[PDB]
């Protein structure tokens, strides 16, 4: 149909706009501490701790699948990188850290994508 065609259109217009939302909240990761999974080979225990691990190159798998239906699903993922970081590791860990200063930078851009998606529709 063709209403499913602008349905798919807009689809493609949220992913467009979620994948600039996701560049800008890695370039606030610049040690790259989040960008891969937690490797289980290193950190055998991982999953008796995490029940549901996040990073940004699975994100980026998930949105280059149109795998975002609406930002709230983004957000998500977004924060189970933030928030399953801040329980494994300590506050004293350069880990915790990066993860509270990702949070704090990555809360201004996310505030503004949530008015362009909104505004645009």
């Given at each position: 149909?063709?209403?499913?065609v ?17 560049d800008?909240?890695?370039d606030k ?12 080979k290193?950190?055998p225990?991982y999953?008796?701790h995490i029940?549901?691990?996040?990073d940004?190159a699975?994100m ?5 699948a149109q795998?975002?239906?609406?930002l709230?699903?983004?957000?998500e993922?977004?924060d ?10 300590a506050?004293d ?5 990066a993860?509270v ?6 809360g201004?851009?996310?505030?503004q994508?949530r008015?362009?998606v909104?505004?645009?529709g």
């Amino acid at each position: 149909s063709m209403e499913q065609v602008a349905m798919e259109l807009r689809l493609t217009e949220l992913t467009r706009l979620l994948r600039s939302v996701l560049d800008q909240l890695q370039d606030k990761d610049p040690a790259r501490i989040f960008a891969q999974p937690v490797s289980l080979k290193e950190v055998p225990d991982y999953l008796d701790h995490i029940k549901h691990p996040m990073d940004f190159a699975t994100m980026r798998k998930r949105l280059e699948a149109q795998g975002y239906k609406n930002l709230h699903e983004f957000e998500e993922d977004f924060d189970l990188i933030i928030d399953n970081c801040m329980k494994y590791n300590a506050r004293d860990t350069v880990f915790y850290r990066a993860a509270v200063r990702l949070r704090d930078q990555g809360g201004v851009v996310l505030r503004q994508a949530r008015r362009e998606v909104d505004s645009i529709g």
